[PDB]
């Protein structure tokens, strides 16, 4: 099961919906805007404004994704034992997922990969700030090396 | 030629062996970074046009006492701070310091230039003091 599939199901899709979440900043004006206010001219964003902005964006993913996740995967164990990923542990924890839960890790930077990429909704910097958003919403612990 | 306003007013030559530019260098206190931070500091000092008469001579302004305009100004300061420095509560107050400041005052648009209140705009009173004065052709 593809990590975007239980985002991708929804009539305004997850990332969609976050696209959206520059109407809740002081002001913003646009999603340029938004990945210029959030981090400076590099990555390693302000911490600030990150948690202004993670502040807004926890209601979409406990409201909408838990509720959504909760029925698609209960959806897919009825039909066979499947391998599902995800972007962080309390994606599987909060839609109260059964079966194994294995964190993971990559030995790369994965950071610049959202870079390399290009055809991706929104720009690269809009995948990038949604990355570090999901790896706000992780509940430390150890990945513990995917191979 | 034609510089327009910004206010509406009326009344053998081959490659030299020396040029080029690939890597090798990144500046360590960051370009960038200190371009952003002049940038900000660079902004010309607010304009407070407040108690001073527009053109017909009613003195620009809100309607309320000069303390309540300090307080309501240093309220403002320290908020804006407060949003500046990304924090619920700002660390630089500039309200309810230490100190007794009670007899501070500022400039709002309840006093006009004569020393009296603002209570009617100029052109009213003026208006109404030149209307105690005309006269009417006979029936």
Request: aromatic content about 6%; proline content about 5%.
């Amino acid at each position: 099961v593809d990590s975007d599939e239980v985002g991708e199901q929804m009539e305004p899709t997850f990332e969609h919906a976050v696209m959206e979440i520059y109407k809740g900043i002081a002001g913003v004006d646009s999603l340029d805007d938004l990945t210029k206010w959030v981090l400076n001219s590099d990555l390693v964003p302000h911490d600030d404004r990150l948690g202004q902005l993670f502040q807004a964006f926890l209601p979409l993913a406990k409201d909408l994704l838990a509720p959504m996740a909760r029925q698609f995967y209960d959806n897919s164990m009825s039909e066979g034992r499947l391998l599902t990923f995800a972007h962080a542990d309390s994606e599987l924890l909060n839609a109260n997922y059964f079966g194994h839960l294995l964190r993971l890790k990559i030995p790369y930077i994965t950071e610049v990969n959202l870079m390399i990429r290009k055809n991706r909704e929104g720009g690269e910097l809009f995948q990038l700030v949604l990355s570090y958003l999901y790896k706000m919403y992780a509940t430390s612990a150890q990945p513990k090396w995917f191979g | 030629k034609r510089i327009p306003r910004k206010t509406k007013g009326k009344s053998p030559a081959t490659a030299e062996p020396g040029t080029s530019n690939c890597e090798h260098y990144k500046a360590r206190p960051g370009i960038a970074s200190v371009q952003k931070a002049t940038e900000s500091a660079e902004l010309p000092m607010k304009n407070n046009d407040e108690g001073t008469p527009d053109k017909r001579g009613n003195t620009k302004g809100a309607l309320v006492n000069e303390h309540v305009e300090a307080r309501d100004e240093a309220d403002d300061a320290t908020k804006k701070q407060a949003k500046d420095t990304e924090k619920a509560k700002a660390q630089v107050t500039y309200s309810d310091t230490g100190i007794n400041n009670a007899n501070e005052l500022s400039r709002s648009g309840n006093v006009d230039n004569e020393g009296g209140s603002n209570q009617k705009p100029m052109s009213t009173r003026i208006a109404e003091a030149t209307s105690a004065i005309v006269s009417k052709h006979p029936a």
